[PDB]
């Protein structure tokens, strides 16, 4: 098989500027017609692969004009001319000269944005939810930047540890921000036992820790 | 325009066969073009898988060669992906595409001797100017969810989370939706969740405490 190569997962760039993405295959995909048989595809957060270039430096339709692909035979370049928040995801380089096609291992587009502070809510367990014996304490942390959060849980001042998980969004297609949520499990025993619950957050853009808090 | 659509079971036992249809709209698959199935491991790693072309030509991944047929109902411009004696190894999203350019939305099949288990759905109440609203989407097997609001007219501000596997071997996630909170008192906010594998909608109304 032909091996496709991505050596770099992730590239940094800020908005408004350029970056080059790098693809190497194993053997060259010059045919011998000329054509260089090299696909590149962008994957955005939630949607299936879209075909960018095609036969190495070919723009396909629809594509702005700011895609273009260069390379020899067998090392290729994706360069993104004024990369802006639209633009994240991951690019991933496909060689369509021989059976079976292979794909690089794909590089994610990182925007290096501005700072931009959490705006932060916090949620109770549903009364539905507290009839089947467990409580769940939501705290939402929206629209952020950079990634790195310190989230912290308080019941009754007396600090949280073991009890939460936290996912986080994709860079964001729009704005390039983060978001997360960090989820308190709990008995419903346990959640009545208590009467403050305050989710604290620390972070980049915010010069004191936000926390946020209600009374059972 | 040509859509490609997958279905097919989310969960298939260790060591039987996976089963996928692919059903194309506005194109005839006798056509021209070959049909391809792509699939996407976890973490992300692509891997072609073979095709059945317009003339109903195969062509095989010699990774799976000997476990995989790919083939086609031309009365119902379907194409079909069997993969028998599936491993842990072949859980992953499964695509099915027209060529490079026509993708399908990609179907999720996990490998597992577990059960289905359809999601609790507990509203996240807004406790201004702005407000956020969301669904607590709880307890489901195995993934994914898909969740969207209003039927499909809300769509600005909202972020659903990905899901996380609890140490119970069930997914949860919450969807939440940034509002105004002049509209908390007369503005109708519903989440619509739907867990496919279970073939389970559920519509949670969300409302101020
Ligand atoms: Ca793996």
């Known amino acids: 098989d032909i091996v496709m190569t991505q050596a770099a997962p992730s590239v940094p760039v800020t908005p408004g500027e350029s970056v080059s993405i790098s693809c190497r295959s194993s053997?060259?995909?010059?045919?011998?017609?000329?054509?260089?048989?090299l696909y590149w595809f962008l994957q955005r957060p939630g949607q299936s692969p879209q075909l960018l270039i095609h036969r190495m430096s070919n723009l396909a339709s629809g594509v702005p004009d700011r895609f273009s692909g260069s390379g020899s035979g067998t090392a290729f370049t994706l360069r993104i001319s004024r990369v802006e928040a639209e633009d994240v995801g991951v690019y991933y380089c496909?060689?369509?000269?021989?059976?079976?096609?292979?794909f690089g291992g794909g590089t994610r587009l990182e925007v290096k944005r501005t700072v931009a502070a959490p705006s932060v809510f916090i949620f109770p367990p549903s009364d539905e939810q507290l009839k089947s014996g467990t409580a769940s304490v939501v705290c939402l942390l929206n629209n952020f930047y950079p990634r790195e959060a310190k989230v912290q849980w308080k019941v009754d001042n007396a600090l949280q540890s073991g009890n939460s998980q936290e996912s986080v969004t994709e860079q964001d297609s729009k704005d390039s921000t983060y978001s997360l949520s960090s989820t308190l499990t709990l008995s419903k025993a346990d959640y009545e036992k208590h009467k403050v619950y305050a989710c604290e957050v620390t972070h980049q853009g915010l010069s004191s820790p936000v926390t946020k808090s209600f009374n059972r | 325009d040509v859509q490609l659509q997958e279905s097919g079971p989310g969960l298939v036992k260790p060591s039987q066969s996976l089963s996928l249809t692919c059903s194309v709209t506005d194109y005839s698959i006798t056509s021209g073009y070959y049909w391809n199935w792509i699939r996407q491991f976890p973490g992300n790693k692509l891997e072609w898988m073979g095709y059945?072309?317009?003339?109903?030509?195969?062509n095989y991944n010699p990774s799976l060669k000997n476990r995989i047929s790919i083939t086609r109902d031309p009365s119902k411009d379907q194409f079909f992906l069997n993969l028998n004696s599936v491993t842990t190894e072949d859980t992953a999203t499964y695509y099915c595409t027209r060529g490079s350019l026509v993708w399908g939305q990609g179907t999720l099949v996990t490998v597992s001797a577990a059960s289905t288990k359809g999601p609790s759905v507990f509203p996240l109440a807004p406790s201004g100017g702005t407000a956020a609203l969301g669904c607590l989407v709880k307890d489901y097997f195995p993934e994914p969810v898909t969740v969207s609001w209003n039927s499909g007219a809300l769509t600005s501000g909202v972020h659903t989370f990905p899901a996380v596997l609890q140490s119970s071997g069930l997914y949860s996630l919450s969807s939440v939706v940034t509002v105004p909170s002049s509209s908390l008192g007369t503005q109708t906010y519903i989440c619509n969740v739907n867990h496919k594998p279970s073939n389970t909608k559920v519509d949670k109304k969300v409302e101020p405490k």
């Open positions: 059945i072309s317009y003339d109903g030509s195969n």
């Open positions: 053997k060259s995909l010059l045919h011998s017609n000329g054509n260089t048989y």
């Open positions: 496909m060689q369509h000269l021989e059976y079976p096609y292979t």
